[PDB]
């Protein structure tokens, strides 16, 4: 019974509780869950950015996050269950029961981590770290594995929390080729700790249209604080899906080898601040934009850079309407632990992301374009000021990573 080829009838969810949401050539449903996860990404990204200073870089994986809480939702109930459904926009899949979201998420996951004869690498790894002493719901254990491939590794939080903490940390590190290390802050995790849910995503790809290192040069990058700084500017000319949108904002899509995944950059005109664009970046707007890209010849100016970000998801989420899940008194997670202890609540939620962009990725290459004469009136895209960045799986219309490059300098 392979879930990736299974009919909803072949995967009994038998969840503790249920919620009824109100009101191309791919899967109608994974298409919808895709729309869902994106509504969360933008909304959550907006919130996140609003709480950050304009010169700070931002990076995270809305997919990871949506996946994590979707995993938690499995044992959620009542108001915790609704709030989760509402906050992560799953409730926006008309008349669909909270449990269907999971079959869908199962389908979405299959497509994303196809592992086929591809060139780009996109991997996912979810794992439950529970206290060896606790007895978790069988169904919760079962479904978490069938739908998200999450195993339930027993750890001793009661006695060796710290040793248990290193275990988790070490596992994430392995699943993220060491780019994501101490996911968990020493402070967290202790004897009281019973469960640590974790979702990892790891992607590495080569530019389908190479940037010759030989052309990379220093250029000034203009921060939002009116200052400048020296950055490494990659350069190349060629055809890319592009589009000049509202108030001169430039949208550009750089695909990776395989064509399934791309990097989309949103660059406002020097006049307009990125903060303005972020406040206007609506799910429906970002949709309109993406759908409007058209192939074109342009000059691309884009800085190399590494971005490492980490933050608590707790506050942001609460502001967005996720409260019960964090309330020792209001939380409702009966489906997770079996026999008593029912009032389990999420004490904290953390996210740590990594991003490195350059030529080659993996100092040894060059490019030679002979007999080329492009239009002297060709359109240029010079990313020497803050801009947004996305790493999406086009065919599935999924945002795997998003962020902001407000300072690529050194």
């Amino acid at each position: 019974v392979d879930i990736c080829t299974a009919k909803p009838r072949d995967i009994p969810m038998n969840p503790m509780c249920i919620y009824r949401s109100p009101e191309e050539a791919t899967n109608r449903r994974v298409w919808e869950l895709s729309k869902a996860n994106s509504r969360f990404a933008t909304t959550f990204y907006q919130h996140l950015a609003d709480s950050k200073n304009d010169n700070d870089n931002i990076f995270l994986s809305p997919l990871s996050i949506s996946t994590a809480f979707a995993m938690t939702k499995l044992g959620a109930c009542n108001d915790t269950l609704q709030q989760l459904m509402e906050v992560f926009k799953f409730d926006t899949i008309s008349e669909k029961t909270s449990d269907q979201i999971h079959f869908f998420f199962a389908k979405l996951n299959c497509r994303l981590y196809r592992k086929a004869n591809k060139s780009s690498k996109l991997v996912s790894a979810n794992r439950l770290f529970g206290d060896k002493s606790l007895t978790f719901n069988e169904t919760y254990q079962d479904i978490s594995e069938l739908v998200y491939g999450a195993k339930l590794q027993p750890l001793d939080f009661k006695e060796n929390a710290e040793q248990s903490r290193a275990a988790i940390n070490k596992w994430v590190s392995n699943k993220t080729e060491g780019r994501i290390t101490d996911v968990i802050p020493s402070e967290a995790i202790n004897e009281l700790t019973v469960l640590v849910l974790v979702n990892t995503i790891y992607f590495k790809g080569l530019w389908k249209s190479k940037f010759s290192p030989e052309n990379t040069r220093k250029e000034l990058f203009y921060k939002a604080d009116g200052e400048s700084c020296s950055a490494s500017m990659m350069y190349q000319e060629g055809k890319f899906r592009y589009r000049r949108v509202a108030e001169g904002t430039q949208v550009l899509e750089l695909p990776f080898k395989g064509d399934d995944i791309t990097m989309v950059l949103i660059l406002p005109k020097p006049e307009k601040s990125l903060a303005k664009v972020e406040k206007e970046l609506t799910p429906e707007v970002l949709q309109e934009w993406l759908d409007e890209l058209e192939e074109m010849m342009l000059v691309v100016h884009m800085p190399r850079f590494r971005i490492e970000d980490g933050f608590s998801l707790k506050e942001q989420l609460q502001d967005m309407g996720l409260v019960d899940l964090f309330s020792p008194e209001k939380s409702k997670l009966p489906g997770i632990v079996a026999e008593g202890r029912d009032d389990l609540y999420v004490s904290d939620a953390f996210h740590k992301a990594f991003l490195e962009v350059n030529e080659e990725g993996s100092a040894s290459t060059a490019v030679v374009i002979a007999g080329r004469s492009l239009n002297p009136n060709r359109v240029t895209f010079k990313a020497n000021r803050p801009f947004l960045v996305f790493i999406r799986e086009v065919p599935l219309n999924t945002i795997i990573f998003m962020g902001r490059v407000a300072n690529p300098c050194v």
Partner: peptide, 6 residues
Amino acid sequence: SEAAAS
């Protein structure tokens, strides 16, 4: 590009 998260 190389990206990761957790």
